Design a protein around this ligand. Sequence first.
Ligand SMILES: CC(=O)N[C@@H]1[C@@H](O)[C@H](O[C@@H]2O[C@H](CO)[C@H](O)[C@H](O)[C@H]2O[C@@H]2O[C@@H](C)[C@@H](O)[C@@H](O)[C@@H]2O)[C@@H](CO)O[C@H]1O
Ligand code: CL
Ligand code: HG
Ligand code: HG
Ligand code: HG
Ligand code: HG
Length: 264
Amino acid sequence: EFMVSLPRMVYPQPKVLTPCRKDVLVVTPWLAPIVWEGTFNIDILNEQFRLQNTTIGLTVFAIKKYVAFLKLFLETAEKHFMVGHRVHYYVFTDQPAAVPRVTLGTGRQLSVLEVERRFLSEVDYLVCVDVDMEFRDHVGVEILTPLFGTLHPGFYGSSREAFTYERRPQSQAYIPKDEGDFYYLGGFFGGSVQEVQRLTRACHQAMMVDQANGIEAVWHDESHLNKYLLRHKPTKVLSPEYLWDQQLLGWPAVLRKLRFTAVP
Ligand SMILES: CC(=O)N[C@@H]1[C@@H](O)[C@H](O[C@@H]2O[C@H](CO)[C@H](O)[C@H](O)[C@H]2O[C@@H]2O[C@@H](C)[C@@H](O)[C@@H](O)[C@@H]2O)[C@@H](CO)O[C@H]1O
Ligand SMILES: [Cl-]
Ligand SMILES: [Hg+2]
Ligand SMILES: [Hg+2]
Ligand SMILES: [Hg+2]
Ligand SMILES: [Hg+2]
């Protein structure tokens, strides 16, 4: 679509002969960037997405006891998630009345869905995450792209052989030992509404086939997500900065920021 020009901007000149990071891979073999702190200038990116009046949908499921995590989740999202852009929260829950009344910033709204074309006409991108988490730092438009996956915090430095993919050929999520790029997290993925719906559609159909064959992938949804992203390469990959567990993994030097974390 037609994109208006950016305005004059003053910032440090990128250095061709100076790599962003020398400690991590910042681009995949299919030329998709791997998002690490230091790889992006958020001011430039904010401009690009605001000029498009981008709206980001954030979906979360809060069933049973999980509704207790909504308060902290939404409060921290208000401080760190897509601040400055239009955000539409979609809370899928079996307890609508238990959803906490969280004060939202302007241009941000929340819909409670008790437990789709609606998404296509309301938002431009969909971000799907787990509710038992909290934002601790910036999570912005640098992640937006047609399709993105997140590097699992406990496997980013492992060989594909060690990845806990589904290894049974009887499963639709099956991935042999000599295949695999990364091990993506089932708890943080997204992209354009169209790409997210295509992925969800493919995973549901795959899980149904497994269901009929009497088999369940070792890591359920996450196993199918990994098979899907192996066959349809994400256009951006998020670093472990985007989903970390400090209590369990600490704070490695490779992580300059801990943006989204598990709640102990
Ligand atoms: C090789 C090894 O030691 N693997 C450990 C991982 O299994 C742990 O993460 C868990 O990974 C499985 C898939 O293999 C699945 O994704 C689980 O949801 C995941 O555990 C969750 O996410 C973690 C980051 C923690 O927040 C945990 O509390 C969650 O229940 C990781 C983390 O425990 O450690 C590796 O050692
Ligand atoms: Cl979700
Ligand atoms: Hg850089
Ligand atoms: Hg979603
Ligand atoms: Hg899938
Ligand atoms: Hg999936």
